[PDB]
Design a protein around this ligand. Structure first.
Ligand SMILES: *S(=O)(=O)c1cc(C(=O)OC[C@H]2O[C@@H](n3cnc4c(N)ncnc43)[C@H](O)[C@@H]2O)ccc1CC
Length: 290
């Protein structure tokens, strides 16, 4: 059984479970409606996302879920991250309630708004999106949190087009990861990892800045796939040689200098998220919406 925490505990009959949002091998997430989430307003419903364990689940699976929830509690609230909203831990299965992003992940979001060959994105929108992710990371970095898998897939979009970093409190042991394991879409995660993290198993804020650069590339290609057709072994050889991706079309020289700056071979020489936030702020201001 779990110890109760009156800070986040919500009654089970106050949560109306709905349709599934997706599964995996660890757990599953479902859409739901929560009544009286806020103490002040107990007669209004709020759409939320609920994470739970699956059927044949180990004690390790359960321990990881608890860890994720605990990390979120300590980290605190921020507009550009998926925030914790409550939990059902007593007399039943564990339910972790978080904010709901109705427009899916950033990759999907971008791909659906590409030009034809329903909604479109201006240059300012793209830069604004980048600015939001940098702010989220800046906050997370301030609370000593290292993401380890920052990518477009792990960034969700709300109904009012707000970017929110997801899966940041995840518990994933180093040296147990499969480099050859692919994603649901068919991409390899090793393609977002800084060289030092990929070869020497060293994760830091600076390694997350490297992944942010690949994320910038994903934004300006509207959801492109990095290193398409490149297997793991050839990826290693490209990184050892200093290879860097080419500048996407309809990207300014200034934004492609930023990407390169994030991909600096020496980790101390890349910009911090505090700096990235400042630069993107000035760029958003000067970028056309026409
Ligand atoms: S878990 O730790 O196994 C886990 C599971 C999932 C997952 O099943 O993802 C499936 C789909 O659900 C979407 N999704 C997750 N969280 C949200 C929120 N808050 N709003 C909307 N949609 C959400 C995913 O984007 C995916 O399509 C994901 C992550 C974990 C943690 C490692």
């Amino acid at each position: 059984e779990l110890p109760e925490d009156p800070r986040w505990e919500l009654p089970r009959d106050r949560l109306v479970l709905g349709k599934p949002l997706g599964e995996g091998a660890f757990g599953q997430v479902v859409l739901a409606e929560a009544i009286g989430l806020d103490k002040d307003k107990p007669n209004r419903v709020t759409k939320v996302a609920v994470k739970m364990l699956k059927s044949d689940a180990t004690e390790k699976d359960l321990s990881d879920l608890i860890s994720e929830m605990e990390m979120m509690k300590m980290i605190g609230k921020h507009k550009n991250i998926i925030n914790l909203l409550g939990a059902c831990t007593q007399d039943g299965p564990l339910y972790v309630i978080v904010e709901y992003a109705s427009k899916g992940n950033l990759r999907e979001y971008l791909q659906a708004r590409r030009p034809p060959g329903e909604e479109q994105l201006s240059s300012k929108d793209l830069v604004s999106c980048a600015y939001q992710v940098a702010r989220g990371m800046e906050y997370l970095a301030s609370k000593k949190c290292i993401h380890r898998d920052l990518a477009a897939r792990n960034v969700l979009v709300t109904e009012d087009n707000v970017m929110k970093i997801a899966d940041f409190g995840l518990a994933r042991d180093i040296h147990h990861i499969d480099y050859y394991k692919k994603t649901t879409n068919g991409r390899l995660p090793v393609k977002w990892m800084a060289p030092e993290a990929l070869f020497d198993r060293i994760y830091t804020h600076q390694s997350d800045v490297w992944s942010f650069g690949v994320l910038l590339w994903e934004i300006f290609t509207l959801g492109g796939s990095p290193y398409p057709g490149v297997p793991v072994e050839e990826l290693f050889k490209l990184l050892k040689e200093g290879h860097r991706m080419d500048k996407p079309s309809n990207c300014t020289n200034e934004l492609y200098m930023m990407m390169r700056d994030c991909w600096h071979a020496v980790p101390s020489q890349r910009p911090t998220f505090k700096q990235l936030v400042e630069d993107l702020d000035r760029i958003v201001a000067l970028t056309s919406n026409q």
